[PDB]
Write a protein that binds this ligand. Sequence first.
Ligand SMILES: N=C(N)NCCCC[C@H](NC(=O)[C@@H](Cc1ccc(O)cc1)NC(=O)[C@@H]1CCN1C(=O)[C@@H](CC1CCCCC1)NC(=O)[C@H]1CC[C@@H](CNC(=N)N)CC1)C(N)=O
Lengths: 10, 284
Amino acid sequence: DFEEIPEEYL
Amino acid sequence: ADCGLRPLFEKKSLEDKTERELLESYIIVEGSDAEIGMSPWQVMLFRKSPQELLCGASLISDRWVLTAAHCLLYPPWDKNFTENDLLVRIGKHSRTRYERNIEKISMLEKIYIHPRYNWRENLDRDIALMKLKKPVAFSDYIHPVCLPDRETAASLLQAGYKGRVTGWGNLKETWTANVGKGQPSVLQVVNLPIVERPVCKDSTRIRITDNMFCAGYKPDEGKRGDACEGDSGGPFVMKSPFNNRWYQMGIVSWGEGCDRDGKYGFYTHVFRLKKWIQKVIDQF
Ligand SMILES: N=C(N)NCCCC[C@H](NC(=O)[C@@H](Cc1ccc(O)cc1)NC(=O)[C@@H]1CCN1C(=O)[C@@H](CC1CCCCC1)NC(=O)[C@H]1CC[C@@H](CNC(=N)N)CC1)C(N)=O
């Protein structure tokens, strides 16, 4: 359901 | 110092669609779609993996985020999140989309939970602060809400006076998703009336403390609305008619069912815990 955020913050 | 004044509203002297409802009273289930920039202090506590929404929260400065303690620590549900487990998403409107160029994602530096938070019995002192690793940049969608002082709390925390609750929580108490109405596409808002302490107490068997207040409509009032799963940690605000600034009087804490007749939502009394907030911020 949740769109993929940029890996930069993961 | 510039808190409680939204870029897209107070700053340009525009009013949002329901703020007049609150002023008229001065002497999320069944809510509605929030306007853009209507709640610049709204924060989403986000779990790294599996990526999901943990709670609501609020921005009180460029480095501090306020929320409910039970959002981070709740032994009954085996909940005990640590700094790196989370992320704070600010400047959002859509629940699931990554709002490029508008939202800002922050990593947590340190969690501070109230030392006397009662998770064992009644969620007493359900409050927690989060310090961000780096300051967040204010914008049209990102701005801090103000924290109440003794006088402000005294004049606004009265039965009948309405407040505003926002969040991306469920639309209905009864388990539902994107198929039969359950999760909202965008931020939800609802204005609710503060309720008389005796009434709050008579609505439950749980022991109610002075660190909490309850809000919501009575069955006789016809109007509905309440927070729900996914909304905790979120802000309960009020617009001061004295200086036209938004103040966070409460924190979405707990209830017994969502939008139930004869029942009400309970919120953490922010002002009663301000000394603790100050100390933490001043000490760190
Ligand atoms: N994770 C789980 N295992 N279960 C999730 C249960 C969620 C219940 C739901 N809660 C929530 O959505 C959120 C946010 C909120 C705050 C105020 C408000 O007016 C509305 C929502 N907050 C919370 O999760 C906090 C931590 C425990 N919370 C509760 O609501 C408690 C209330 C008390 C718990 C003892 C210590 C003092 C506080 N109840 C619950 O989990 C129960 C929910 C359903 C039952 C009736 N349904 C049933 N099948 N038996 C009544 C109570 C709500 N409003 O009751």
